[PDB]
Design a protein around this ligand. Structure first.
Ligand SMILES: NC(=O)c1ccc[n+]([C@@H]2O[C@H](COP(=O)([O-])OP(=O)(O)OC[C@H]3O[C@@H](n4cnc5c(N)ncnc54)[C@H](O)[C@@H]3O)[C@@H](O)[C@H]2O)c1
Ligand SMILES: NC(=O)c1ccc[n+]([C@@H]2O[C@H](COP(=O)([O-])OP(=O)(O)OC[C@H]3O[C@@H](n4cnc5c(N)ncnc54)[C@H](O)[C@@H]3O)[C@@H](O)[C@H]2O)c1
Lengths: 334, 334
């Protein structure tokens, strides 16, 4: 019969623009993940030119199902072109999330994807930090000032009112300058420092969030203060030594991280890491199966690959809220 | 910026309802497939209950890219519930196709999927038959009278005006009766015979098309007339002996058919089949790299798993035609 179409403005109007809906949504989805009440096939990458092509040039299909009270299925179909911002003044990433009624498997919603994606990704850092950051941490570091960085920063400030300073670095000086200028105005009672190198930024963060497009690590273990928590959202930034030297290593999904061509799998393929070495999956922290941070000296790394259930749960929550406020465009399927 | 939304009515209005657009679209896509100008990752199945669950209960993600003059990307996200028709009076399958501009990877269209899917699947039979059926064949067999069967029958009659009789069988007597009754009225100058068993139908077809939801073969080799071409659209219907005894075996995509849990892969895993034993991929027939039928005695089997480039090429063609006729709903992405 019908589907609800929700563009980015619709998603914002329905609450998608505040970290809290994503935090609520992921707390629930990560709970279902610890209880194994979900299905989540490996996400395939479509690259139009698989080797002759930049690694941020792909479109990823991300299907998942989450069981429970209000069981939902769906897919995030999210594209990327590295030079969308530099060459076309367009956001790098774009896409759609489709939601499906598990009774019929019929599609019931078509939604813009990149706001939800950046926002659920920021919620991952928020929930991880609730468990893995020093309580009361004052100093946050953001590396990379694109859309992901922006949303990470927004959500952390919304969710942690004890943050006092924010150290920012970007490889592109100008990007950094505009970003801190923007944010110093958004939040005047917080001190934003544009740093001159990555080391200065990292060294000064109690929470360090990576939001770049690198494929060569630059973060060294010895940059990290005792008691640091690093949320390695952009994956490639952290040197291998950090996975080895960190007191605790958390992932979102071990199976999804032990992929052939992955840093963790490589350390495992050598004799430098195992599943036994892994401290926890994130959902296990949420449920209290495994403890989070245990002292203020531990250096803790989160390596989160990204999980379809995060997109699907978030979108479902926003879909319901939109329907509640009569937001969106009703489409006929037939 | 914008996306074109095309529901089923829009797709019909834009030409999607005539086999010719699909035949043109697939001839081109199958050409690009023989020239390896495409990318097509393995299609993952999401099953909410992967073992405790019917095999027609799943949603499949089908991404692909086709290069060339007007290079296009996209995904078909197609769901299925076996008891949608029996229990809910709904079509078994449903879904959406998303199209993407390969320059930016941005989504540019959202389209209803099941009409296009059933229609491209019928075009596969049509193009295969052009190469693999006896020229002038008079007798067509359809097994299974659901939506796939209906579209196969429609497209064959549109494309081959020398068909004189159509033998129909369905496990559900009533389904068959209504189907032939409907079609005898649609096409009075053609003779439709409701058969009493599958053997009677198969035995009398020069072209035999399987359109069921079985997961146990019932078609024996000795039912098949010399000179028969069988388009095994519903895959599971044909006994293994037929892959072995057939003079020629064609597939759409060898890599996609030599999957671990597949009939062909099983024959290969035993010593009963190889890639050398395979006569052709379909695209190779289209381009004239490998010959089609060579005499009127050969018994020929097509085993086509289904390929995302078929959906994407078809949808792109219809998208262009819709835009040409100002058909559809314009959505904003943001
Ligand atoms: N689940 C997840 O883990 C998840 C989810 C979404 C996005 N991501 C990742 O987030 C990243 C950022 O995405 P985005 O949309 O904001 O990209 P973007 O193009 O908007 O911005 C990336 C920024 O990082 C800067 N940068 C690049 N390399 C750098 C380096 N070596 N040092 C410092 N700065 C550097 C760039 O100049 C740019 O400002 C991507 O890598 C993406 O894959 C991860
Ligand atoms: N690319 C491809 O190869 C491709 C593409 C699309 C669909 N399909 C397949 O087409 C098939 C039919 O789909 P549909 O949408 O029309 O399903 P449907 O439920 O609409 O109809 C299936 C019909 O077959 C009948 N049937 C079931 N088992 C039978 C048996 N053993 N003998 C005779 N009749 C039997 C049923 O009663 C029903 O009438 C599905 O198996 C689907 O997976 C294949």
């Amino acid at each position: 019969r019908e589907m609800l179409y929700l563009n980015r403005s619709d998603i914002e109007q329905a609450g998608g623009n505040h970290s809290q809906v994503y935090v609520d949504a992921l707390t629930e989805a990560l709970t279902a993940h610890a209880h194994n009440d979900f299905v989540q096939p490996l996400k395939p990458y479509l690259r139009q030119d698989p080797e002759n092509g930049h690694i941020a040039d792909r479109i990823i299909a991300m299907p998942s199902h989450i069981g429970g009270e209000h069981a939902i299925s769906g897919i995030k179909w999210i594209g990327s072109k590295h030079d969308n911002p530099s060459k076309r003044n367009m956001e790098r990433a774009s896409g759609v999330i489709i939601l499906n009624d598990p009774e019929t498997n019929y599609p019931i919603a078509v939604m813009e994807a990149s706001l939800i994606s950046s926002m659920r990704t920021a919620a991952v850092s928020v929930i991880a930090a609730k468990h893995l950051a020093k309580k009361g941490f004052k100093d946050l570091t953001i590396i990379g000032c694109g859309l992901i960085g922006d949303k990470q920063l927004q959500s952390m400030l919304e969710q942690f009112d004890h943050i006092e300073r924010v150290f920012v670095y970007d490889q592109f000086s100008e990007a950094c300058a505009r970003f801190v200028d923007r944010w110093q105005q958004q939040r005047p009672e917080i001190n934003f420092i544009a740093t001159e190198n990555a080391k200065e930024a990292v060294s000064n963060g109690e929470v360090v969030i990576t939001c770049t497009v690198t494929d060569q690590p630059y973060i060294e273990y010895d940059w990290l203060q005792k008691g640091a928590f690093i949320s390695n959202i952009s994956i490639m930034d952290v040197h291998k030594e950090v996975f080895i030297k960190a007191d605790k290593v958390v992932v979102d999904d071990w199976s999804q991280c032990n992929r052939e061509k992955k840093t963790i799998n490589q350390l495992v393929l050598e004799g430098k890491f195992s599943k036994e070495a892994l401290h926890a999956e994130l959902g296990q922290l949420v449920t209290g199966d495994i403890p989070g941070r245990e002292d203020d000296d531990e250096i803790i790394l989160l390596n989160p690959m990204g999980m379809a259930i995060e997109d699907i749960s978030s979108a479902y929550f926003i879909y319901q809220q939109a329907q509640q406020q009569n937001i969106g465009t009703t489409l006929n399927l037939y």
